[PDB]
């Protein structure tokens, strides 16, 4: 419910998550944001569960920006098969998120509403998160 | 259940004598696919693009920028 | 000058090249002290094994 | 989960015991299999109640007395 509509390649290898985020570290759209404290794969079905929850908190709202998108294919061998005989099948897609990246922002809504919407949204994510405001530093990047 | 699994014998390409090295007429100095180095002074290219010393001397590499890189053998 | 290089910590479990350095220096036993010309080459090997050595300047 | 044709059935009120394998095949059938499924769907939970009632009074194997499916 977020995936590339086309890929050059169908499955791809796993890689590591060293370091903090290539960038994506400063706010840049809305007023408030959710930043990642820990590295993780974030599954589209999570990213969407997180989105949806806020939109529902707004009930008819401001804007919800989504700044990470799941372009990495997630593979799994079916159950009970042994080792080998190829690489499994793509069961999902994830977004790779190293620490300090801003995953979601909101605008168009009161400070008390972002503090919530971003908080509840946080819980659907599988990692630690900070809520943030626009700074001057985000404005100067 | 794999359509994959092939790959081909590896080709050992690249420069075989570096700048400053002493060669002998006939030495292969570069193994390449197409022209990553043009032959410069005293260096010929063979039907596969391999470059080789035409005379005994010393290799020198030259980077002509837009014109590409060249391998020369400065005779001794 | 000269360097006086004493081997204070065992190379066992360290890489072969650092073992080799220790040899180019000529230090074969723990605690052994060697008195060594201070050239750049000698200093290089003295620095390579620096975590196994105690150095001080001399003559 | 559990993917019945129109509504629901929800998200885990169903009971699947893995019991041992009857008949052919050795110690593995005697032992690691298992690999066999009894299930319990106790007829009053979830469901449209039109399925529940058309399900409850029907005479069928696979559908118990108190049944329970």
């Amino acid at each position: 419910m977020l995936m590339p509509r086309r890929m050059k390649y169908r499955k791809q290898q796993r890689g590591r998550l060293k370091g903090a985020t290539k960038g994506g570290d400063y706010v840049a759209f809305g007023d408030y944001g959710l930043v990642a404290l820990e590295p993780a794969w974030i599954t589209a079905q999570q990213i969407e569960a997180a989105r949806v929850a806020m939109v529902r908190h707004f009930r008819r709202g401001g804007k919800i920006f989504i700044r990470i998108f799941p372009d990495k294919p997630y593979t799994k061998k079916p159950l009970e098969v042994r080792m080998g005989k190829g690489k499994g099948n793509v069961e999902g897609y994830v977004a790779v998120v190293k620490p300090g990246r801003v995953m979601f922002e909101v605008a168009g809504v009161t400070e008390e509403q972002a503090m919530e919407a971003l908080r509840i949204a946080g819980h659907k994510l599988p990692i630690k998160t900070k809520i943030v405001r626009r700074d001057a530093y985000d404005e100067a990047q | 259940s794999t359509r994959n699994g092939r790959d081909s014998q590896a080709k050992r390409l690249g420069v075989k004598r570096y700048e400053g090295q002493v060669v002998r007429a006939g030495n292969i100095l570069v193994r390449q696919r197409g022209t990553r180095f043009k032959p410069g002074k005293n260096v010929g290219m063979g039907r596969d693009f391999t470059l080789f010393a035409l005379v005994d001397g010393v290799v020198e590499f030259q980077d002509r920028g837009r014109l590409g890189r060249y391998v020369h053998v400065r005779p001794l | 000058p000269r360097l006086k290089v004493k081997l204070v910590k065992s190379p066992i479990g360290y890489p072969k090249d650092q073992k080799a350095a220790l040899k180019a220096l000529g230090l074969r036993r723990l605690q052994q002290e060697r008195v060594l010309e201070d050239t750049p080459a000698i200093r290089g090997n003295v620095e390579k094994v620096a975590h196994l050595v105690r150095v001080e300047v001399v003559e | 989960i559990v993917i019945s044709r129109h509504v629901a059935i929800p998200d885990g009120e169903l009971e699947i015991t893995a019991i041992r394998a009857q008949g052919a095949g050795g110690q593995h059938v005697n032992k690691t299999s298992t690999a066999i499924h009894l299930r319990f769907d106790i007829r009053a939970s979830s469901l449209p109640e039109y399925y529940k009632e058309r399900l409850l009074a029907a005479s069928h194997h696979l559908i118990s007395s108190d049944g329970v499916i």
């Binding site: 930043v35 806020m54 008819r60 401001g62 300090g100 001057a136 530093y137 990047q141 | - | - | -």
Partner: protein
């Protein structure tokens, strides 16, 4: 206001060290000048949050010398989200490219319809002389409606203060709201 900040020349000092002490290290420079400095962190900060890259900061150096400056870039640390290091640009008399804030005056009829105002620039790039640094530049967003937009071609301006950017650039928009009835569909 005219914002003033102390500051001090550093040489060998490791920024790790400074940073540890509460001192955000930085450089200052322009065509005639380049010097390694630091400011105090918590002090620098006092200023910057009100100041930013919009208003002139005046560095007071120990030699007594006091130079007027604009902040060029703050290099952030991605992990902490804390300023790592600051570029101080010494203004002189010339004109200079820079970023001037926007007041978006008035309540769009795009909002009040239930919409939301996306400020796509909180500020604008501008060539201008340091005598001319406008405290801001206002925009009427009132006549803006859901779907509508504002391009900086239609930005007001003082004298002068020539724009530096394609007037085809887009400074504001009014987008429709997040909505729950949207959910079932999607």
């Amino acid at each position: 206001m005219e914002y003033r900040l102390k500051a001090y020349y550093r040489e060998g000092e490791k920024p790790s060290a400074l940073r540890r002490a509460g001192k955000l290290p930085g450089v200052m420079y322009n065509r005639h000048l380049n010097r390694k400095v630091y400011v105090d962190l918590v002090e620098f900060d006092k200023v910057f949050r009100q100041a930013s890259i919009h208003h002139v900061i005046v560095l007071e150096l120990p030699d007594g010398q006091s130079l007027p400056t604009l902040v060029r870039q703050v290099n952030l640390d991605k992990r902490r989200r804390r300023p790592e290091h600051v570029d101080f640009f010494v203004l002189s008399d010339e004109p200079v490219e820079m970023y001037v804030p926007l007041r978006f005056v008035g309540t769009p009829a795009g909002v009040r319809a239930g919409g939301v105002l996306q400020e796509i620039h909180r500020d604008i790039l501008v060539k201008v002389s340091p005598r001319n640094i406008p405290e801001f530049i206002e925009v009427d967003v009132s006549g803006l409606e859901i779907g509508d937009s504002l391009h900086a071609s239609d930005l007001k301006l003082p004298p002068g203060v020539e724009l530096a950017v394609s007037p085809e650039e887009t400074i504001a928009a009014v987008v429709p709201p997040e909505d729950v009835e949207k959910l079932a569909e999607e």
